[PDB]
Design a protein around this ligand. Structure first.
Ligand SMILES: O=C(CO)[C@H](O)[C@H](O)COP(=O)(O)O
Ligand SMILES: O=C(CO)[C@H](O)[C@H](O)COP(=O)(O)O
Ligand SMILES: [Ca+2]
Ligand SMILES: [Ca+2]
Ligand SMILES: [Ca+2]
Ligand SMILES: [Ca+2]
Ligand SMILES: [Zn+2]
Ligand SMILES: [Zn+2]
Ligand SMILES: [Zn+2]
Lengths: 219, 219
């Protein structure tokens, strides 16, 4: 299943990845960011509906200098003490947020259109693939509409969220280790269930992959 | 005229459409009074609008809570994370500054992103403020989260004419807690939904549709 999913990712397709019944119990739509299109963004906002985020391998975040948003807030809590009252001290370690900064490519206007978000994401993967790390600040601004996620060091070895799982899968496909993901939301107000997302994959002929499968394959 | 109608709509917990200006974003946001938000509103916003789902707060509220603009948090944090410095939004195309603030989740939510969780977070925020329980902010919410907050400018539309100020302006005029939840309406072509298509939506679902100038003048 993993290998089949790698083939789909290499073709610029969206695949579906479920984490686990024990964790978020959620399914994310996933694309290799280097192949993102305005169409992917439209399908994600319409059919998934969660936040559209772009996950980056730890090595990339270290080269760009991108930290966890929690670390940015903790440092800033010195001046803005409310950020201290909002500390996420009640979240299980395994679920600690992968949230990083938000950005827009400077060439975008409002930054929120499908065209703008696909451009912002595609230009970021372009910059990273080409190794023009220093051009990051020249080309992008923060805050913005595209949320970046920082994957854990050692990926699925230390954290098993969609952030790690999907980046691990892009690494395994020999692609730039950056993915764009969006949680699938249901009409009952909760996350779409595993059976409901498996059903969506069958209808739209997309690959449905199990998180444990990626984890086992990678490890 | 239509402003009064829009006010009556907001008081009834309904959604209204607010277009800013051709000379600004040229976008239309679906808007609801946060004290009246429901999971169904979140679902209509993500499926039929599609942009980010943000919650705008009157500056007075922000001051009582100590909530700063995100750019200020990043500016201060740039002392530790240099990349932030190089990500400054010094070239924002449509206005002098962003209304972006911190993101939050109520501590009682699970993943924070579901319709049920996002409505719970926003409504509880509106209730806490309505009850003047500001000292409970940190006790009930954490950051980062899936709900993005926006800080309206001091003096509302007197100093900034964004959807952030305009909607907070309307809520105030309606004698409601000055906190709104807004989502940009996106088009199938990849650009923001056109003034025309947003009009067709409003007429089809009988929602009050307003323009920026009308709200500003009325305020
Ligand atoms: O929080 C999220 C988006 O912002 C989603 O859960 C997304 O799948 C990435 O998070 P995680 O790695 O914890 O699964
Ligand atoms: O940035 C945004 C995300 O919520 C939208 O533009 C929203 O309408 C608020 O921004 P503004 O006050 O500039 O119109
Ligand atoms: Ca998560
Ligand atoms: Ca804006
Ligand atoms: Ca201005
Ligand atoms: Ca009608
Ligand atoms: Zn997840
Ligand atoms: Zn706007
Ligand atoms: Zn209708």
């Amino acid at each position: 299943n993993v290998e089949k999913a790698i083939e789909a990712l290499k073709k610029g397709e969206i695949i579906l990845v479920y984490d686990s019944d024990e964790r978020e119990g959620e399914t994310d739509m996933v694309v290799a960011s280097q192949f993102i299109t305005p169409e992917h963004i439209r399908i994600m906002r319409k059919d998934a509906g969660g936040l559209i985020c772009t996950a980056l391998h730890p090595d990339i975040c270290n080269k760009l200098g991108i930290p966890f948003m929690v670390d940015i807030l903790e440092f800033a809590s010195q001046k803005f003490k409310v950020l201290r009252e909002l500390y996420p001290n009640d979240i299980p370690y395994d679920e600690k947020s992968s949230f990083s900064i938000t950005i827009n490519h400077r060439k975008t206007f409002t930054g929120i259109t499908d065209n703008d978000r696909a451009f912002t994401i595609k230009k970021l993967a372009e910059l990273v693939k080409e190794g023009r790390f220093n051009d990051f600040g020249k080309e992008f601004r923060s805050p913005g509409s595209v949320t970046l996620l920082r994957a854990a060091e050692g990926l699925v070895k230390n954290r098993q969220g969609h952030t790690e799982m999907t980046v691990a899968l892009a690494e395994l496909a020999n692609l730039v280790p950056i993915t764009t993901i969006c949680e699938m939301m249901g009409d009952d107000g909760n996350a779409m269930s595993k059976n409901e997302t498996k059903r969506y994959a069958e209808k739209h002929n997309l690959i449905y992959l199990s998180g444990e499968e990626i984890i086992n394959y990678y490890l």
